[PDB]
Automatic annotation (TrEMBL), chain D:
Mg(2+) 9 binds at residue 250. Mg(2+) 11 binds at residues 339, 342. The chain holds residues 74 to 423 of 423 of the full protein. It comes from Thermus thermophilus (strain ATCC 27634 / DSM 579 / HB8). This is RNA polymerase sigma factor SigA. A motif (Interaction with polymerase core subunit RpoC) lies at residues 138-141. Mg(2+) 5 binds at residues 219, 226. Residues 306-324 bind DNA. Mg(2+) 7 binds at residues 223, 226. The lineage of its organism: Bacteria, Thermotogati, Deinococcota, Deinococci, Thermales. Coiled coil: none annotated. Mg(2+) 6 binds at residue 223. Sigma factors are initiation factors that promote the attachment of RNA polymerase to specific initiation sites and are then released. This sigma factor is the primary sigma factor during exponential growth. The gene is sigA. One of its GO terms (cellular component) is cytoplasm. Interacts transiently with the RNA polymerase catalytic core.
Length: 52, 48, 105, 345, 210
């Protein structure tokens, strides 16, 4: 019941954009991806502020 | 003849789907590594 | 489809403009249209069958043809060929024909 | 919103706006429709441009621009240069000649209204050939296909009114439209009729006996060349095709289709046969003297299975000669090593 | 130009009367008025997403929540298009593909009885129409008939892609059953999909009491 559960949460809303406009609702980690390549590699951080 | 079984060809349900889908404006292509075609209906869809 | 993708991309009545222009002739003024319906050309706004007709063939096209024989027939010929009949002309015989529309006869 | 109420409303309005006078205006537009052809046939007698051209460039000048000649039909005619240059030749025509064009135009114009008017007449008839297999709007549609067809044929000089002349044509249209588009499978008009009588007699047959007639009774009643063989043959074609998809047995998820097997395909125990046949036949096909074997391998085998036109240039005698001896010599070495005995096929 | 389509100065309709030199001049102009998929197809062709995208970028972030809210659901789609996708002029139809033959059979049933899928008729439907459209456009036709047929042409085009969306057509009486449309065959709308995951049949399987 912990597996299936996280699959109910694997979704995060958007508010502070960069690539594509706000309220988008996207996979939690896919955002751990863009955020990670924007402040780590391709500088000029665009801290995507998401909501659980 | 006694040899392993040939790996699966494409599923008629699939194919029947792809064509049953193109039946509508839409277009369902299948891609490889690089976003470039792969021919599921082998040969047949080539014209004439 | 609920999200009208041709109604979204095209800021046309999401589901009512198309719905009224697709399956019939409730015409949308595509390119120009110089002339006015009191107002200039509605670049991307539609008009009625009746109003489109008022454009093409100009404002009026009425065919009030007379009754009896020697009646209105004399008020016509005498006041029809060339006479710039103003709006609301008063033909004088059976009842009162009403030439309520402009310039020529 | 729900069709037809509009398509009927669409002309009830226009018609309702211009119901052309029973005689006068029908005559008006009538006259102004013949002098059209007259004109055009004469223009052609001067322009050299085929009647089609003169007739096609006068329509595109009145009803629709380049747009009309581009989409409905591809670009054989240049939107600009072609049409414009054709009309350019009509203005160059002297007073006497430019005279007809001015007519040709107003005429086609006349053909417009006249047709638009009688669009109420269409639906009237159409209101009866309803149940057959043609949509109501469809019915109307092929119905107009006879009305505008009238416009070419009418002869205002012959005093008979128009409305009634269109009647025939119109009804003719709907009828062909019924014999053509009403079914999935096409049958000739000849058989079409041959089907009504064959169904019309069954009627008087249901009338008495009580026994839904044997193909003997119905055959008698009909007439001359009608044999019991025919009726059983003529009715199978009558019945309308059945849906490949239909609730089968205990109507549930089970779709009628899975019930029909396949054939073109070699069900495994057939492909498995080719691989043995083909590999074995070809094998024995290698222990033979090239010639006859090949010409008969390629004759029955290759193109299409005439001992004469058989071998290249040698006569029939050496054909049969090595034939029956080789073939048979073939049969008795195979019978030995029993490869082909067990009739694979 | 003679009696008819004759665009003059600001007024563009000329009727002739060779009686007395009366070059009639009714007053309408080049008011491009179109209806049907045409105007749509046109309106889409003349689009340049890059412009409308940036326009909404402004339209979005600044105006009040009101007209900026829609502006976003509007930019979302535009972007998808503008992305690595396929430029959005193709949402319209001017050429309908055609499902294969053996995938919509014309079978032998019980002697005279033939077997044919529910889509071959949703096609003949079209075909006939589309043609009919063409003949009448040649035949030379009054207006109220072109549209009316054009209309009917629309119907059928949906009716084949996907039925009941606007209305439910039916093989001539006997079966008030809808004709199996395309996506229908896709979604298994008539208890087909379910069955598809309700199973398929193994080649070397068996059963029996335990």
């Amino acid at each position: 019941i912990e597996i299936v559960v996280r699959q109910m949460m694997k979704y995060v809303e958007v508010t502070d954009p960069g690539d594509s406009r706000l309220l988008e609702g996207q996979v939690l980690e896919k955002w751990d991806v863009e955020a990670l390549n924007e402040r780590l590699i391709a500088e000029g951080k665009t801290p995507v502020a998401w909501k659980p | 003849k006694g040899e392993d079984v040939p790996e699966p060809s494409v599923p008629e349900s699939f194919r029947v789907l792809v064509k049953e889908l193109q039946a509508l404006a839409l277009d369902v292509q299948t891609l490889d590594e690089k976003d470039n075609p792969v021919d599921i209906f082998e040969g047949l869809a080539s014209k004439r | 489809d609920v999200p009208s993708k041709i109604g979204t991309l095209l800021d046309l009545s999401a589901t009512e403009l198309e719905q009224v222009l697709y399956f019939s002739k409730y015409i949308v003024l595509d390119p120009k249209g110089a002339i006015l319906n009191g107002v200039p050309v509605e670049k991307r706004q539609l008009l009625t069958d009746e109003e489109y007709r008022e454009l093409r063939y100009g404002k009026q096209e009425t065919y009030p043809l007379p009754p009896g024989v020697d009646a209105l027939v004399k008020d016509g010929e005498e006041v029809v060929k060339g006479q710039e009949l103003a709006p609301g002309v008063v033909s004088r015989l059976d009842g009162v024909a009403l030439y309520r529309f402009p310039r020529r006869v | 919103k729900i069709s037809t109420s509009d398509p009927v409303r669409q002309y009830l309005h226009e018609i309702g706006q211009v119901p052309l006078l029973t005689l006068e205006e029908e005559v008006e537009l009538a006259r102004k429709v013949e002098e059209g052809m007259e004109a055009i046939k004469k223009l052609s007698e001067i322009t050299g441009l085929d009647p089609d051209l003169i007739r096609e460039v006068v329509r595109a000048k009145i009803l629709g621009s380049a747009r009309v000649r581009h989409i409905p039909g591809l670009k054989e005619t240049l939107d600009p240069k072609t049409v414009e240059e054709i009309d350019q030749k009509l203005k160059s025509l002297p007073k006497e000649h430019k005279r007809y064009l001015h007519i040709a135009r107003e005429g086609e114009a006349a053909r417009q209204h006249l047709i638009e008017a009688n669009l109420r007449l269409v639906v009237s008839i159409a209101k009866k050939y309803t149940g057959r297999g043609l949509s109501f709007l469809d019915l109307i549609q092929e119905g107009n296909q006879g009305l505008i067809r009238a416009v070419e044929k009418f002869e205002y000089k012959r005093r008979f009114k128009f409305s009634t002349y269109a009647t025939w044509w119109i009804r003719q249209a709907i009828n062909r439209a019924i014999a053509d588009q009403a079914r999935t499978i096409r049958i000739p008009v000849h058989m079409v009729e041959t089907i009504n009588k064959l169904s019309r007699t069954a009627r008087q047959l249901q009338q008495e006996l009580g026994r839904e007639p044997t193909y003997e009774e119905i055959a008698e009643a009909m007439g001359p060349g009608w044999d019991a063989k025919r009726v059983e043959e003529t009715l199978k074609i009558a019945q309308e095709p059945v849906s490949l998809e239909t609730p089968i047995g205990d109507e549930k998820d089970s779709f009628y289709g899975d019930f029909i097997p396949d054939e073109h395909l070699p069900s495994p125990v057939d492909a498995a046969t080719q691989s043995l046949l083909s590999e074995e036949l070809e094998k024995a096909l290698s222990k033979l003297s090239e010639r006859e074997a090949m010409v008969l391998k390629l004759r029955k085998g290759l193109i299409d299975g005439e001992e004469v036109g058989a071998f290249f240039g040698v006569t029939r005698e050496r054909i049969r000669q090595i034939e029956n001896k080789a073939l048979r010599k073939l049969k008795y070495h195979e019978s030995r090593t029993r490869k082909l005995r067990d009739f694979l096929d | 130009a003679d009696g008819g389509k004759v665009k003059s100065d600001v007024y563009g309709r000329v009727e002739v009367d060779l009686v007395r030199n009366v070059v009639r001049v009714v007053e309408s102009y080049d008011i491009d008025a179109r209806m049907g998929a045409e105007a749509i197809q046109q309106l889409l062709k003349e689009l340049d997403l890059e412009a409308l995208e940036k326009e909404l970028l402004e339209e979005m972030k600044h105006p009040s929540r009101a007209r900026r809210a829609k502006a976003r659901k509007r930019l979302e789609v535009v972007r998808a298009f503008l992305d690595s996708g396929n430029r959005p002029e193709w949402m319209i139809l001017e050429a309908v593909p055609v499902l294969p033959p053996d995938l919509r059979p014309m079978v032998q049933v019980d002697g005279g009885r033939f077997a044919t899928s529910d889509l071959n008729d949703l096609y003949r439907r079209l075909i006939n129409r589309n043609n009919r459209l063409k003949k009448l456009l040649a035949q030379g036709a009054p207006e109220i008939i072109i549209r009316n047929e054009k209309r009917m042409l629309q119907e059928a085009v949906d009716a084949l892609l996907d039925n009941g969306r606007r209305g439910a057509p039916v093989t001539n009486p006997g079966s008030d059953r809808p004709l199996r449309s395309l996506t229908d065959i896709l979604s298994g709308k008539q208890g087909r999909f379910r069955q598809n995951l309700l199973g398929k049949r193994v080649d070397y399987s068996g059963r029996s009491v335990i």
